[PDB]
Each structure stands twice: as structure tokens, then as C-alpha cells.
Design a binder for this molecule. Structure first.
Ligand SMILES: [Ca+2]
Ligand SMILES: [Ca+2]
Ligand SMILES: [Ca+2]
Length: 434
């Protein structure tokens, strides 16, 4: 966590912007949380900061004999004396879904039940280091994630899965359109060897897109190898990659990358609410993370890194549109942005789409297109990264991007065009970095 904090710029968010996640509540659905008791027995990283601790998988037992859940929650918001999570003043809703057999039987059949329970408790961010390895398929769980986000103010994150490095290995519900799906790059702890020596390396195991219908997943990356975070007092050494001390130990997986991003979302949401005067919609938090992300060196579009590695300080300050307009087929919204040529210009359009059928061959329901015009007339179409940049149109993704490394100083025109919106009108968010 301490090195991940610096890689994703949560250190700048904390030290220069004051963002530790205070006032935000993150829900984690995972194995269990240390002793399973919201009292003074609880691990120092969560003692006193638990909004609610629910036992779903084992009636009346939310403890963590595995370790996964405690480490995950630790990375979101742990506030112990060392190895703090990214949002260490956020409060925690924890849903313990591990069943007596070690499986995830506490999950309800309809995942909307899980998310609504968390929402009722006050959580507005819900993070899930779990999934089924269904090679990019959009399942009932994916559908319910999508329906839930379109109807409720909840940012939902899912791990991409650990079936890399082959293409097309994204887990469900990480295949949901409206979640933020997170893959793992390496942490920088090179004494532990090749899994933690290059922050621009995709971890070998991280699942890779595209999804079954060709969409780019994961959406973003974060460090997910040799992450030092909270150690359940009931977990054995075999659950960890390496020991550290009685309260903290190492783990790696997309399960570790996801909660780093979830804590960054708490920091970002705090910033919008306290410092920018608005409650940012899930689509805007997602767009802002995407526009701020760093190309780890593979270029775009790319299923190995998605849109790149979270870089939180760039996301804090984006120019935005927060679902303030909705579009039906053939309509367009227009914005103008004055750019400066010193720095890259990155524009990200994200929408919380209508849920797809589990039987559809193409999951995108409502298709918006991003079209940008430079001061000197050059046009760019969302996700067209091959010159000429206005000839390849996107009909699959509900994230569209125009990234220009050396922009012209001057006013750029930004159009969001409703190509085909059968379940309309469709709103959207934009985030702009320059
Ligand atoms: Ca490496
Ligand atoms: Ca499109
Ligand atoms: Ca092209």
C-alpha cells in the first residue's frame, strides 16, 4: 500500500489536496474482516471506522479465516499506524460473503440485493475482488450490476480476474459495462523479484480483454503485486505471498489492485463533494479516472492495460460534464474547451448504459459517439488511435476517448453524438485533462 500510494498519486491527493476520504463510505464485499466483531477486538486498521459489518456467507460469523477480505479492505481505507489504505479516513461497510466451505455462497442470487444493502448503510462506492472466469461473457450478475448503477448513485468496482496473460480472459461481473473493472500492474518492490520490478508492467496473471463482444476491459489498472496491507489475525501464512509483521502481510492479484482504485474513488468523490460543489455520478468518477490514467507503454486500444494506470492527481482537477444532458437518437451535445499546447489533452466520454440481455451477442445498448474538432479543423473520433483519426468509429464500448499528446493551443469543440439510443434518452459524463 505505501508504494502503491505513491504510484497512483494518492500521496499527492492526501498531502497537497487533504483528501483522505473523510465523509465517504466504501462497501467491500469479500471473505470477512479480521475477528468479525465491530468492537475493540478489531484489527487496528478498521477499529472505530466500521459503519456496518454484515455476515452473509456464514450466519452470525463475519470473521476472516482466509485473509483475502481483510487485506482488500486494508488497501481501500486501512488506518493503522503503518501500511494505510488509500482513503484511510473513509468509513467501511463490509459484507462477509465467504461460506463455511471457503466459497462465496453469501452472495445473493440477485446482486442488486447486495448493492442495496450497502447503499442503505450509506455506502456510495462498492468494491468487489471476486468473479467467475467466463472469458468475457456478460452474465446475469453483469446485467444486475449494470441495471443497479443506471438506477442508483453507486460506483461499483470489480476485479478483472487472474487468468492472464492470454487475451479475452475477463471475469464476470468485471464484464459489466457500468462497473469500473480493474486490472493489475506491478508494485515497485523489486527486492521481491520480477513480479514487482516495473510499475509499467501488466502483472502476468492479470486477466486481459477484450470481453466476449470486443469491448475494452479492464477499464483501468493499479498496482496489484506484493501489496503490503492488513493481515487478518485469524489467517495463516499460506494465505499470503510473504510475511511482514503480526498485523500486515503481502498479497498479489487483481483483488489487490481493485481496492486501491476503490480508495482512490473515495478520495476523488470526497474532492468533488467538498471542494467542487457536486455529487459526481458514477459515470463521471469513471470518466475522470480514465482521462487521468497513464498509458503504461502499450498504447491504445489495448485489452492488457485498458485505458491505463490510475493517476489520481490528474483526475481531481478535470473539466467535466456530470450527466447534465441526455440525448436521444440523432441529437448531439456540444461543448468547447480551450486547451494549452504545453501538455497532452485527454477527453473521456463515459455513460452508464442500459443493461444488456445475457443472450445478446453485442452488449452495448445505447451508442454515443465522441467527436472532437481541433482549432485548426482536425477531427478525432472516440477510440480511433490510428491516423487518420476520424475513420474508425466505435460501436461496442460505453467509454470513448480522444487523446492528443501535443494539442494545439486554442479552443477544441467537443461533440457527444447520439448514434443509436433505443433505450433513451441516454445521459453521460465527460472528463477532460490538460
Ligand atoms: Ca516485472
Ligand atoms: Ca460509439
Ligand atoms: Ca483511424
Amino acid at each position: 500500500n505505501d508504494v502503491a500510494r505513491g504510484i497512483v498519486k494518492a500521496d499527492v491527493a492526501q498531502s497537497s489536496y487533504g483528501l483522505y476520504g473523510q465523509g465517504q463510505i466504501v462497501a467491500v464485499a469479500d471473505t470477512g474482516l479480521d475477528t468479525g466483531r465491530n468492537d475493540s477486538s478489531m484489527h487496528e486498521a478498521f477499529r472505530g471506522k466500521i459503519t456496518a459489518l454484515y455476515a452473509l456467507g456464514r450466519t452470525n460469523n463475519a470473521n476472516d479465516t482466509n485473509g483475502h477480505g481483510t487485506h482488500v479492505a486494508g488497501s481501500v481505507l486501512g488506518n493503522g499506524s503503518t501500511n494505510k489504505g488509500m482513503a484511510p479516513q473513509a468509513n467501511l461497510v463490509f459484507q462477509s460473503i465467504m461460506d463455511s466451505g471457503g466459497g462465496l455462497g453469501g452472495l445473493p442470487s440477485n446482486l442488486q440485493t447486495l448493492f442495496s444493502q450497502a447503499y442503505s448503510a450509506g455506502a456510495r462506492i462498492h468494491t468487489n475482488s471476486w468473479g467467475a472466469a467466463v472469458n468475457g461473457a456478460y452474465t446475469t450478475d453483469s446485467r444486475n450490476v449494470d441495471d443497479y448503477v443506471r438506477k442508483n448513485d453507486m460506483t461499483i468496482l470489480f476485479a478483472a480476474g487472474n487468468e492472464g496473460p492470454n487475451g479475452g480472459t475477463i471475469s464476470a461481473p468485471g464484464t459489466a459495462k457500468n462497473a469500473i473493472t480493474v486490472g493489475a500492474t506491478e508494485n515497485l518492490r523489486p527486492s521481491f523479484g520480477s513480479y514487482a520490478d516495473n510499475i509499467n508492467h501488466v502483472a502476468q496473471f492479470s486477466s486481459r480483454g477484450p470481453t466476449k463482444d470486443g469491448r475494452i476491459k479492464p477499464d483501468v489498472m493499479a498496482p496489484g503485486t506484493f501489496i503490503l496491507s492488513a493481515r487478518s489475525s485469524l489467517a495463516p501464512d499460506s494465505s499470503f505471498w510473504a510475511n511482514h509483521d503480526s498485523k500486515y502481510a503481502y498479497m498479489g492479484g487483481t483483488s489487490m489492485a481493485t481496492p486501491i482504485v476503490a480508495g482512490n474513488v473515495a478520495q476523488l468523490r470526497e474532492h468533488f463533494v467538498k471542494n467542487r460543489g457536486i455529487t459526481p455520478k458514477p459515470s463521471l468518477l469513471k470518466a475522470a479516472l480514465i482521462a487521468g490514467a497513464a498509458d503504461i507503454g502499450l498504447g491504445y486500444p489495448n485489452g492488457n492495460q485498458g485505458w491505463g494506470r490510475v493517476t489520481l492527481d490528474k483526475s481531481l482537477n478535470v473539466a467535466y460534464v456530470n450527466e447534465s444532458s441526455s440525448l436521444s437518437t440523432s441529437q448531439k451535445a456540444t461543448y468547447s474547451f480551450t486547451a494549452t499546447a504545453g501538455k497532452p489533452l485527454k477527453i473521456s466520454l463515459v455513460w452508464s448504459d442500459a443493461p444488456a440481455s445475457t443472450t445478446a451477442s453485442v452488449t452495448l445498448v445505447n451508442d454515443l459517439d465522441l467527436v472532437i474538432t481541433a482549432p485548426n479543423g482536425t477531427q478525432y473520433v472516440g477510440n480511433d488511435f490510428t491516423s487518420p483519426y476520424n475513420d474508425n468509429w466505435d460501436g461496442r464500448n460505453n467509454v470513448e476517448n480522444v487523446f492528443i499528446n501535443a494539442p494545439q493551443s486554442g479552443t477544441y469543440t467537443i461533440e457527444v453524438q447520439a448514434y443509436n439510443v433505443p433505450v433513451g434518452p441516454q445521459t453521460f459524463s465527460l472528463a477532460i485533462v490538460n
